[PDB]
Amino acid sequence: QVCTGTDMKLRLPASPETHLDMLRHLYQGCQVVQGNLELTYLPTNASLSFLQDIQEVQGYVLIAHNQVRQVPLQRLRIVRGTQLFEDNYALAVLDNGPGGLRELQLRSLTEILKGGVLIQRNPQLCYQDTILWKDIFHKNNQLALTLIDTNRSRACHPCSPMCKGSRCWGESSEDCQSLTRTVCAGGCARCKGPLPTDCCHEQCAAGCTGPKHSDCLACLHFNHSGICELHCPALVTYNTDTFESMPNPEGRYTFGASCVTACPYNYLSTDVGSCTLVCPLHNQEVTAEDGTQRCEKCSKPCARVCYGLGMEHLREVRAVTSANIQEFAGCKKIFGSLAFLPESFDGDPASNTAPLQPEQLQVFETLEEITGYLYISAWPDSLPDLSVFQNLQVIRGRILHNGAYSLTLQGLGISWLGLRSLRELGSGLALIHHNTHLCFVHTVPWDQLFRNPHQALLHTANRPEDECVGEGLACHQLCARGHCWGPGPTQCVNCSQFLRGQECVEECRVLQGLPREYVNARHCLPCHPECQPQNGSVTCFGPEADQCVACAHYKDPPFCVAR
Amino acid sequence: KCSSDMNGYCLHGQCIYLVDMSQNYCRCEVGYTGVRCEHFF
Amino acid sequence: EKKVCQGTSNKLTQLGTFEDHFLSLQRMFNNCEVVLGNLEITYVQRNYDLSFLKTIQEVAGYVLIALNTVERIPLENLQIIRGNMYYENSYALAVLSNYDANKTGLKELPMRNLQEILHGAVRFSNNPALCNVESIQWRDIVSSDFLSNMSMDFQNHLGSCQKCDPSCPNGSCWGAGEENCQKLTKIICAQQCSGRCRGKSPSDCCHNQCAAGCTGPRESDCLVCRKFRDEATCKDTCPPLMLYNPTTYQMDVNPEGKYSFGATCVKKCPRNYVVTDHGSCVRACGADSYEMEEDGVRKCKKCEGPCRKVCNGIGIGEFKDSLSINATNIKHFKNCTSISGDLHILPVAFRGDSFTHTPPLDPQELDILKTVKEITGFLLIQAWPENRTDLHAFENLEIIRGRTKQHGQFSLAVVSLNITSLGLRSLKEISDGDVIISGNKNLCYANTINWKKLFGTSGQKTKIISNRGENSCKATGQVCHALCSPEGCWGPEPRDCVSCRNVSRGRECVDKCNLLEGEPREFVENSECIQCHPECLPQAMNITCTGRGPDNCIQCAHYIDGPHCVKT
Ligand SMILES: *[C@@H]1O[C@H](CO)[C@@H](O[C@@H]2O[C@H](CO)[C@@H](O)[C@H](O[C@@H]3O[C@H](CO)[C@@H](O)[C@H](O[C@H]4O[C@H](CO)[C@@H](O)[C@H](O)[C@@H]4O)[C@@H]3O)[C@H]2NC(C)=O)[C@H](O)[C@H]1NC(C)=O
Ligand SMILES: *[C@@H]1O[C@H](CO)[C@@H](O[C@@H]2O[C@H](CO)[C@@H](O)[C@H](O)[C@H]2NC(C)=O)[C@H](O)[C@H]1NC(C)=O
Ligand SMILES: *[C@@H]1O[C@H](CO)[C@@H](O)[C@H](O)[C@H]1NC(C)=O
Ligand SMILES: *[C@@H]1O[C@H](CO)[C@@H](O)[C@H](O)[C@H]1NC(C)=O
């Protein structure tokens, strides 16, 4: 139920036909949004039924440029706003406007921690001005920015007469706001009614139902199992009896604004339990032999580290150019991402930005792991596949392109993928659009490449089936269960035979063939060539020449030499 | 007064017995302290 | 401010007579507020004064009031009982059996500021005359965690005590005068917060880490902290130095963060404790750890390889209940190098215990402790056989950290012995604690140690008196040493000068290491001449060896390999 949220500030979607499909795959089933609830560029006739269970959004909520009739955020409970769109804005509704947002219908939303409200240029909304935002905002930022749109160009009905105060969100009777700050008595933070008994616990942020500390509507600091308090319990409990240090068996991990049993994949755990995307200095990402990872401290030098996009050395630049091709020399585990913008192959005068060469892209042959995203949007006419990234094993995807995608291919002349050793895609999605030459998109086993239930393939505007049947675009029968990458016989992810040098073949040359190869459990490798070929029997067993029943020229106890 | 079980129990003290506590018990001297009168000042 | 009071560990035990225990109680608990040990008020007669008990604010252990005759024990300003030690494994406040033959014991006990006990329970029994304590409820004090094991009774037979004050609710008064009632903060309080409260208002209760009430919603206006203490405030855990940063995505310095040494938060760990990754001043690190300093201060890292054995010692871990090392636990310290605990050499080990069924200790088994090198806690030595004259069992004792001290003051306690020399030839540094030499018979050579250059921690003294006498070690058999520095000598044997004039080869010193009339030729290096390359031919009235290496000779012995002198 943990979805990371998109990162689309104001830009256009890459694929408008599957953008709503992307929101359906990523924002369905979420309850605590770790990132940003962003809904950008949605036209009419949009089934928005996936927004019926999102309650907690840790970032900013941005509903912009949408032509939908309404956005169903009635179950939205709290907007924390750890990250903000502008400097002091958290709930921004811009340029939505027949279509346009009729009513916001924010029923259970009563607490915004950090940020402000930006309602502007929306001539379809009625009640943007009659909402008391001081009741929702926190006391420390009561002097916030409350820019409210004025022009509406449509007169509508007044509020419902059943609830007083003239604080309504729409036209329905159950769609009016109950005050949680100004109706209280004394020094209560939040309260249910005007009575002093109906005040809430001091950790309850968005209200409560009872006076206990385990039944807030949405409490403030760190939730675990209902009982939430100021600080989450750490893994090591410091005792004051004999001044010893005991680990806590009941200590949870810190994950955003809540605490769970163990935080999921693509979150590196630390010693203090605060697992996040990247680890700080004097730390190395190691494997805890359980499928998860947990970075710890390292030695004194700790050199030989490779940095990528979104790190200390690379912040402003987005395209891989020749200015930073030296930094990716020989490193196997790139901390960061790799993005191939269309400006990476263009010649800009008076800027010392030389375009790349196809022979210069061979430095990524030893690359096996990318911690970020792979945004390839430009490719020359040298070779039609990704043989420069043929040894890429796992993509972590902790840093995503626009917060939603990890493997993005835009406008390429690619014909087959060629990603042989790709066995695990961590986070994000896969988007291939406006690529009319790539046919082998549905034959890839994308279900075995996933590690989360909220991951799916989004393919559109590609080469259809009719250009792949008459042209013979189909690989050999060696790839089992239709799991195929390219038309060559060396790109099967799981074949029924062995491997002669990362290549699925028909039969190992044991009983036949002029050289002889020994049978491995999964592979098929050649042993020493001076072993005597046995006509009609098992010739070679191991790589050392002593295990042959006969060799070619000279018989010695350690091995057989020609001289 | 204590029985013959507390002959080698007290280190530098005389054993006396309490009725309500009903436990083994020593009496330290001047310059002696502890539970069984084993620590110094 | 907040004078630390040590406390005692002598439960119910009478010290000497009644007057001797009264004078020891007056001497021990005078002018102290926070008691880390156990407030044990025992054996007080009728016509004595207990006015020194008013200044005690809080007790970390259990309060043990037993066998008293006085009509009033002024425990007025006793705020909070932490309860870090139990008596009957669940009890903290045990006022038990305070009576006389006239059934006149403790009549009144106005514990006015006592508002919360964190750990333990309350048991009251055997009180014939007792005013208004039977009306004090204890659901207000004891929480719902330890409510099951508590039990008490009150038998007021012919007490002849006056009426309680009806000016306070629920009839709960400690004494009988004005403002002498229980400041109850639990049952007349709102359930909108788990902490305490100062009034009946629902929005005017205390912080989560404020125990026994507070004087405001701000964490500074707070009486005591619950678990961890901050400087003039109360927090849950004071943060470490290097925190996160949302701007540069790197390590940022602390705005208010401090280290964690016990309950309070100090800025710097002392020089003998271990700094961990969580930013807490700890005594002992983890089990799969390796204690080794990196930059000045002592730290611990994760050990690699076998991770063989750590020595717990006496008082912590397995041997918490034991009181002395003996023949039973001597087999667990064979291949031991670092004593990460305490040691207790007592006369109970050298005489045999028929109660615990232990054999008498062989004095030849003290050579097992030659392998160890350091002691983190205190070294208590109170017994020694009457034949050996030196303490050479700790000859390889390098450093004494003093993390745990005997009664919080002394670390190296060599008292009541039969030695003529201390023999601590490798005692080069004592990080914490006082060294006492008292009650001995024939132990001089103690005022010429110059202990001020031994320890570096300020606020420490020394105490050496009444051992041998200044005129008793005047004879020729008892002299410090001749022709060596007067900084320190340990015994009459010439291997006991701390710093010598020329020659400091090993553990001993001589007149000079002969470069002219001697077969070993030793070059002087930092006033410690050591043996040079053995295949170097000695010269005649010349400097033979210059430094450590075969390339520091004029003429080789057998063969010449460049500048070096080799055998072949
Ligand atoms: C020599 O060294 C021995 C240790 O190596 C030491 O033996 C100890 O003797 C103590 C006195 O009886 C014991 O308290 C101590 O541990 C006990 O072990 C028992 C099992 O055999 C436990 O049942 C016992 O638990 C409870 O005991 C009493 C009951 O009232 C409580 O007071 C106590 O707090 C606890 O709740 C306890 O754990 C024992 N240690 C070992 C390891 O056996 C012996 O006394 C030494 N001889 C000397 C100094 O002369
Ligand atoms: C704090 O965490 C608890 C534990 O996850 C939350 O309780 C869950 O709430 C969801 C909401 O749809 C339910 O589907 C689950 O069944 C609940 N869990 C259990 C064990 O009942 C709780 O909502 C969180 N928030 C607050 C304010 O308490
Ligand atoms: C206890 O301290 C007070 C404080 O001045 C002092 O007057 C008194 O003599 C002390 N008691 C003893 C026994 O020293
Ligand atoms: C105290 O009560 C607990 C119940 O929580 C029980 O387990 C324990 O045995 C009791 N007695 C003690 C600690 O002596």
Author numbering:
A (entry chain B): 24 to 120, 134 to 599
B (entry chain C): 5 to 45
C (entry chain A): 27 to 594
Anything the authors wrote about it?
The proteins in the human epidermal growth factor receptor (HER or ErbB) family are some of the most thoroughly studied receptor tyrosine kinases. Thus, to facilitate downstream signaling, it must either form heterodimers with other HER proteins once their specific ligands have bound or self-assemble into ligand-independent homodimer under the condition of overexpression.
Particularly, the high-affinity ligands EGF and TGFα stabilize the symmetric dimer, but the low-affinity ligand EREG generates the asymmetric one. This structure is almost identical to the EGF-bound EGFR/HER2 complex, with a root-mean-square deviation (RMSD) of 0.63 Å, implying that the asymmetric EGFR/HER2 heterodimer is a common structure resulting from various EGFR ligands. However, for EGF- or EREG-induced asymmetric EGFR/HER2 dimer assembly, only the unbent subunit of the HER2 DA is required, but the bent subunit of the EGFR DA is dispensable.
